[PDB]
C-alpha cells in the first residue's frame, strides 16, 4: 500500500533531493560584536525557524506519512537535534575549521568558547565535518543518512498492534540501505568498498547521536539559566527528552 516500498533507488534519491529544506539566514550583524547570550539567541532563533521546515520536510520522507500521528511526533521529538546537527555539519564541509550556521553566520571554535560548555560540542561538529570532507560525502548520500536518522533514532523508544508499524519502519530503512549501496556501486566502488563506506557512514550516526545527547543537556541548562529566549516550540521539544 505504501509508495515508499514501490520506489526505486534512483526514485528514492530524487524524492529526497526534491524535499531538501532551504538554507536559512540568521539576523547576525557583523557591526555589533555581540555577547554569548546574543549568539545563542541567534542560534535559538535560527533553530526554531529550521524546525518548521524540518517538520514539513519529514512529511516528504518516504514512509513517514504511512506512520501514525503520535509516532511521527515521537520520531521528530527524538531526532530533531540530530537532523539539525547533520545538516549544519553538511553545510560546513567546504569550510574547514568553521561552522556555517547560516550563509552570513560562519563561526570558528574561538567564538564558540563564548558560551559555557559550547566549545566541546563545536569541536565534535568540526570533527564530523572534516570526517565528511575526507570521505568526500555526496549529497545523495547525505539525504539518505538524514532520512535514516529520522526513522531510526526513535524506533526503539516507542501494544501488540503498535509493533506492526514498527516493522514498516524497518522496511523503509532497508530500502534506504539499498539506495546507499546503489549509489556506491554507481560511483565505481567494489563490493568490498561499498560495505566499508556503508559502515563508515552509519558509524557517524552514533557520533551524531552523541552530539545530540550532549546538545540536549546543554539546552536544558539554558532554560533553567533563563538567559536566552527559547521559543515555545524548542521548549516543547526540550521537554520531550526530560
Amino acid at each position: 500500500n505504501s509508495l515508499a516500498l514501490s520506489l526505486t533507488a534512483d526514485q528514492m534519491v530524487s524524492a529526497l533531493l526534491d524535499a531538501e529544506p532551504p538554507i536559512l539566514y540568521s539576523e547576525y550583524d557583523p557591526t555589533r560584536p555581540f555577547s554569548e547570550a546574543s549568539m545563542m539567541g541567534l542560534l535559538t532563533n535560527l533553530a526554531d525557524r529550521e524546525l518548521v521546515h524540518m517538520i514539513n520536510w519529514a512529511k516528504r520522507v518516504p514512509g513517514f506519512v504511512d506512520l501514525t500521528l503520535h509516532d511521527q511526533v515521537h520520531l521528530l521529538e527524538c531526532a530533531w537535534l540530530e537532523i539539525l546537527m547533520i545538516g549544519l555539519v553538511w553545510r560546513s564541509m567546504e569550510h574547514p575549521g568553521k561552522l556555517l550556521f547560516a550563509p552570513n553566520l560562519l563561526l570558528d571554535r574561538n567564538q564558540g568558547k563564548c558560551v559555557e560548555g559550547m566549545v566541546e560540542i563545536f569541536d565534535m561538529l568540526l570533527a564530523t565535518s572534516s570526517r565528511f570532507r575526507m570521505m568526500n560525502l555526496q549529497g545523495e548520500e547525505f539525504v539518505c543518512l538524514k532520512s535514516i536518522i529520522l526513522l531510526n533514532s526513535g524506533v526503539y523508544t516507542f501494544t501488540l498492534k503498535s509493533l506492526e508499524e514498527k516493522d514498516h519502519i524497518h522496511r523503509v530503512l532497508d530500502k534506504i540501505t539499498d539506495t546507499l549501496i546503489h549509489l556506491m556501486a554507481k560511483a565505481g566502488l567494489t563490493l568490498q568498498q561499498q560495505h566499508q563506506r556503508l559502515a563508515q557512514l552509519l558509524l557517524i550516526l552514533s557520533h551524531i547521536r552523541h552530539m545530540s545527547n550532549k546538545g540536549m543537556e546543554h539546552l536544558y541548562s539554558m532554560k533553567c539559566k533563563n538567559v536566552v529566549p527559547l521559543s515555545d516550540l524548542l521548549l516543547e521539544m526540550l521537554d520531550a527528552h526530560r
Binding site: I55, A58, K59, L69, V73, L76, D232, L233, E236
Partner: peptide, 10 residues
C-alpha cells in the same frame, strides 16, 4: 502540542 499541530496542518 505545537509539533502535533504543525504535523496536522493541511
Amino acid at each position: 502540542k505545537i509539533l502535533h499541530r504543525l504535523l496536522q496542518d493541511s
